[PDB]
Amino acid sequence: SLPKFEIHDVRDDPAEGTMTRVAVDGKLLLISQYPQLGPRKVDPNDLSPQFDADRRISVRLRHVDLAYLVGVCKERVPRHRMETKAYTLDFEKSAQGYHLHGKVHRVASQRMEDWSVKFDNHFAVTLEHFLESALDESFGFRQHYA
Amino acid sequence: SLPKFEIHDVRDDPAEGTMTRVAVDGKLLLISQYPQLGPRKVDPNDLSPQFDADRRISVRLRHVDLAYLVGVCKERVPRHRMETKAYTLDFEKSAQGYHLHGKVHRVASQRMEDWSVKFDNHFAVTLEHFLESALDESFGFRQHYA
Amino acid sequence: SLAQQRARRAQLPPAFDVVHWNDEDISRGHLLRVLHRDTFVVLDYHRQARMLTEEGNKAERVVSVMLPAVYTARFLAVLEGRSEKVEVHSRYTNATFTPNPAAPYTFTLKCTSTRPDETFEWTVEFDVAESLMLQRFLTQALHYNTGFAR
Amino acid sequence: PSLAQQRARRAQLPPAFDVVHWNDEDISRGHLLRVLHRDTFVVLDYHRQARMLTEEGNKAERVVSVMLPAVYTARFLAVLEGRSEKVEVHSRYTNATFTPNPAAPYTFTLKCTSTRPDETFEWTVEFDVAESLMLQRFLTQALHYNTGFAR
16 A cells, blocks of 8 residues: 545535545655545445545656655745646645646546645645655665665 | 764874764764774784774763754754763854864773864765764664564 | 663654753653654653652653644644644643744643643743754654555 | 566665656757666666657667765765765766756756767766755665665
8 A cells, every 4th residue: 555645625515525635656646636526424434435536636747746846845946837738737835835736637538627726734744744755765765675 | 783984084193093983873872983003004904903992982972962963963053062071062063064072081091181073074964964864763763663 | 781672672662752850949850751652642741750869760750641643743833833833632631832932943832731620730841952853753753654664 | 467566676676766858859868867876886877868759669778877986975965965066976987077057056967078998978967956856865865774774
């Protein structure tokens, strides 16, 4: 299983509910996101997903990217423009924390919609702490010395 | 064997050779320096030791002391002063390097004496890293995960 | 004597201790062992019982706040310069980790821990080193917990 | 099972990272340097692109290679961190250096003059903020382990 940190934006209106996973397989991030599937379904015993992986955004990013994504944190670079055919994103530092926005599409579908995501406060804490981490482990080294 | 780095200085005047070590055992940062014993070795297979192990300057620093030092490398403080029965030392950042001076004692001898060591240029980089590293592993996490 | 001092050592919760022993008023003294133990972030508090010297045991526990893996980023937040404070409500203890306007990069941990209803208090400060200490300790706590140790 | 071997082979391979310097719109511009850590040496694998992007083949090919000593490590870190303004590596078949780029802050340049007896061969890679900080972290990681903090 792989390292990751998530956010559960849940609301009574699934229409706007969401969850935003952030994981790192080796040297590449995967900014992912599932729109709240099903109502605010109550019951811990429910082992079912409460998020629509069918309407999931999954942007695997380059290795150098992790760098940039990080270097932005260190205020070395004001912002970061990642453009592609499957997506267009910009990672800039918000006043409350970090903010990723641009244009991306979900699985089997071609709708380059308008997207925005806010990593703020204690959450901007964890992203930073994560990226700073992910890129440190990316090189392997530890994986190796075992 | 403990994590460590050494700065061997042998000179055509043994009365100046200094084997300066800086190792860390757990939460124990331990600095030391053995004086050059005898002229420089000449036969590659003369494994005899080159530094006087009974003239060694060994000082120990508390888990916080490590921290304070790192606090100094990272500018959260102008210098760190430690007064103790066994020694009196200051760690301060020089414009071109670091400086650990004071008054200490050599083994099996009551006479104490002014002392000092500087970890300049590349030496500061090694020193900076090493400390930042120790304090980072000085909680027993990695090992705890076995 | 140094060899067994490893497989044994390994079997200790990761930690570090903030030590504030007062050599004048045994009371005024306290010790705080901050540590890790399966997700949980425990903080044990102690008051100097025996004297700094005295051939006896110098540390004596009292209460024990146990922060849930959540706050780890929340403390780290005041520690870093975002959060302007952070509070915690155990079943008995009540606290707030706020910075100290005295000296920069230093923090204070205020408390009041009621027990079945016992109004008890303790304010453990963290100076530069200690502030840096916690900070690292915690990061490692999050680094390792979220994974990366694999 | 296409992934059921990334934990087996991972734990063998040298630890390393690469700088994507491809450039289809004209080759020579295209290249991809790989920095690694074998034994206690900084391995520099310089590759000149060959095959274009969208197609096939092997894309890049080894050329000049540098094998920097563990000592030179904290040396480069000196630069990257903002201490030395230059670093000189005198390998046998590859004399070179590494300095800061003035066109941009916290970005650097790795120029080289690999002797090959006669004639001399020039090559150079430019680390952008990312690529630059990248190398720093890598080298930090080395030192850390090289110094034995993983036991």
